[PDB]
Ligand binder design. Structure first.
Ligand SMILES: OC[C@H]1O[C@H](O[C@H]2[C@H](O)[C@@H](O)[C@@H](O[C@H]3[C@H](O)[C@@H](O)[C@@H](O[C@H]4[C@H](O)[C@@H](O)[C@@H](O[C@H]5[C@H](O)[C@@H](O)[C@H](O)O[C@@H]5CO)O[C@@H]4CO)O[C@@H]3CO)O[C@@H]2CO)[C@H](O)[C@@H](O)[C@@H]1O
Ligand SMILES: [Ca+2]
Ligand SMILES: [Ca+2]
Ligand SMILES: [Ca+2]
Length: 425
C-alpha cells in the first residue's frame, strides 16, 4: 500500500490536479496503494489563451515566467504546502515536475526576477540537428528561451527553487527536458549543473530523457533515474496487437539497469500532444499494461491520470478542466491490486512467461510469493502451469475468480481482457 521508499513504489501522475483537489483526494490515493504523487509544474507560468482552464491548454504549464511557487492552474504556495502536509498524513511523498531547462518563449512575459540575472539565457534559436549534443543542449527547444546552465548564478537561482519546494514539503523531482542540459563530461561545453542542482535532500529524483542517440541514458543515470521511453513504446505496441509475447515485453529497450528506471505505459505527452500517440487506448488496455509493468522488479512505474472521459482517440472530452481530479481509473480494483502486489513483492526477483505458450497471456512470478496474470485475449482461458507458489486456494485480488495451486501447478480460468493478482493473505 505504501513502499519503504519512493523508488520501491508506484507513483501516481496527478496530471493537472490542483493542489486542493490533491489534498482532498489523499485518503483515496493512499487506499489505491501509491507511495508518491507527481504534480504538474508548481511554478509561475505564462498563463496563455487568457488563462482559460480547458484541458487543451495543458501545455502552458511548461512555460515558466519566474521560479516563484504558485500559479492559476494548480494554485498557491500555501495550498501546495497544505497539500504536502495532507500527503504526509498518510505517508505519501510528493514529487515535483521541475521545468528548469527553459522559460516561456514570450520574452515580454519573463519576469524581472529572471531578467535580472546577468547573461541568464542561451537564446531562442530553435534546435536544428537533434543528433548534435551541442545543438540539443545549447539551443532552443521549441523556441522556449534556453537557460544558460553554465552560469553559476542561474544554477544557484534554479537550485534555490528546488530547495524551496523541498522546504515546502516536496520530496523529489522529475526534471523536465533533462536531456537538454549538458553533463560535466559533455564535451567542451560541459558544466557542473547536474552534480550541483542534484545535490539536495530530495529522496528520489529522475529526469525525462526521451531516448535516441544523443540522449546518453547511461550517463544521466549516474545522477538521476531515467525514463524508459522505448520500453513504453514496446508495451503500447504489445497492447496494440494484443500480443503480450514475453520476448518483446521483457527487455527494457535501454542499456540502463531497471533499478535506475522509471517506466510507464504512456506519458502525458504521448496522450496529450497533438500526435495522440497513445490516446487510442482504453481503460482495459491500461489495466493490462499496468499489470505488465507494475509487476516487474526494480523499475519504478508511473501511472498517468487521464482526463475524466478521455480515451479511445478522445483527448479532451470537455468533462473536466485543468485543476479538476482525473478519471477514477487511478483507483480501479485491478490497478489497486497491482500496486499492492508491486509493494509487497519488493525485493523479489521475477520470471516472465506465457502460460501454455499463449502469447496473449502474461504471467509474472515473483519468487514463490506472488503471481500476476494478464489476459489480453478476447476470450477466457483456463491455465495449467508450474508455480513456485505453495498449494492452496487463491482468490483473484485484481477482480473476480479463484485459482488453485496443486502439486506446484497453477490452474483456473483467467477471464478475457482481465488481470489477476495472486498471493497469500
Ligand atoms: O511556444 C513554443 C511551443 O509551445 C508549445 O509547445 C508545448 C508542447 O507542445 C508541449 O508538449 C509541452 O512540451 C513539454 C512537454 O510537455 C514536456 O513533457 C517535455 O517534453 C519535451 C522533451 O523534453 C523534449 O526532449 C522533446 O522530446 C523529443 C525527444 O527529445 C526526441 O528524442 C524525440 O525524437 O522527439 C521528441 C518530441 O519532439 O520534446 C518534448 C515535447 O514534445 O518538455 C516540453 C517543453 O516544456 O509544452 C510546450 C511549451 O508549452 C506549442 O505546442 C508549440 O507549437 C510551440 O512551438
Ligand atoms: Ca539547455
Ligand atoms: Ca513531504
Ligand atoms: Ca482525437
Amino acid at each position: 500500500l505504501t513502499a519503504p521508499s519512493i523508488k520501491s513504489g508506484t507513483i501516481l501522475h496527478a496530471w493537472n490536479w490542483s493542489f486542493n483537489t490533491l489534498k482532498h483526494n489523499m485518503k483515496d490515493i493512499h487506499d489505491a496503494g501509491y507511495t508518491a504523487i507527481q504534480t504538474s509544474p508548481i511554478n509561475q507560468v505564462k498563463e496563455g489563451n487568457q488563462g482559460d482552464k480547458s484541458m487543451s491548454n495543458w501545455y502552458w504549464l511548461y512555460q515558466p515566467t519566474s521560479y516563484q511557487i504558485g500559479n492559476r492552474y494548480l494554485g498557491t504556495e500555501q495550498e501546495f504546502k497544505e497539500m504536502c502536509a495532507a500527503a504526509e498524513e498518510y505517508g505519501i511523498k510528493v514529487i515535483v515536475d521541475a521545468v528548469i531547462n527553459h522559460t516561456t518563449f514570450d520574452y515580454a512575459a519573463i519576469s524581472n526576477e529572471v531578467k535580472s540575472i546577468p547573461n541568464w539565457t542561451h537564446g531562442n534559436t530553435q534546435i536544428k540537428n537533434w543528433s548534435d549534443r551541442w545543438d540539443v543542449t545549447q539551443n532552443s527547444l521549441l523556441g522556449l528561451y534556453d537557460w544558460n546552465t553554465q552560469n553559476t548564478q542561474v544554477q544557484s537561482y534554479l537550485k534555490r527553487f528546488l530547495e524551496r519546494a523541498l522546504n515546502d514539503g516536496a520530496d523529489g523531482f522529475r526534471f523536465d527536458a533533462a536531456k537538454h542540459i549538458e553533463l560535466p563530461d559533455d564535451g567542451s561545453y560541459g558544466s557542473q549543473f547536474w552534480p550541483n542542482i542534484t545535490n539536495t535532500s530530495a529522496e528520489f529524483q529522475y529526469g525525462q530523457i526521451l531516448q535516441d542517440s544523443a540522449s546518453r541514458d547511461a550517463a544521466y543515470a549516474n545522477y538521476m533515474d531515467v525514463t524508459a521511453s522505448n520500453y513504453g513504446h514496446s508495451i503500447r505496441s504489445a497492447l496494440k496487437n494484443r500480443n503480450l509475447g514475453v520476448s518483446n515485453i521483457s527487455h527494457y529497450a535501454s542499456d540502463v539497469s531497471a533499478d535506475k528506471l522509471v517506466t510507464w505505459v504512456e506519458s502525458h505527452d504521448t496522450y496529450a500532444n497533438d500526435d495522440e500517440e497513445s490516446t487510442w487506448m482504453s481503460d482495459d488496455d491500461i489495466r493490462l499494461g499496468w499489470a505488465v509493468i507494475a509487476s516487474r522488479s526494480g523499475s519504478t512505474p508511473l501511472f498517468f491520470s487521464r482526463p475524466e472521459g478521455g480515451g479511445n482517440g478522445v483527448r479532451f472530452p470537455g468533462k473536466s478542466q485543468i485543476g479538476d481530479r482525473g478519471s477514477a481509473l487511478f483507483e480501479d480494483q485491478a490497478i489497486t491490486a497491482v500496486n499492492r502486489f508491486h509493494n509487497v513483492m519488493a525485493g523479489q526477483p521475477e520470471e516472465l512467461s506465457n502460460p501454455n505458450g499463449n502469447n496473449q497471456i502474461f504471467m509474472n512470478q515473483r519468487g514463490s510469493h506472488g503471481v500476476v496474470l494478464a489476459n489480453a485475449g478476447s476470450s477466457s482461458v483456463s491455465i495449467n502451469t508450474a508455480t513456485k507458489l505453495p498449494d492452496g486456494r487463491y482468490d483473484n485480488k485484481a477482480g473476480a475468480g479463484s485459482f488453485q495451486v496443486n502439486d506446484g501447478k497453477l490452474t483456473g480460468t483467467i477471464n478475457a481482457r482481465s488481470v489477476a493478482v495472486l498471493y497469500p493473505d
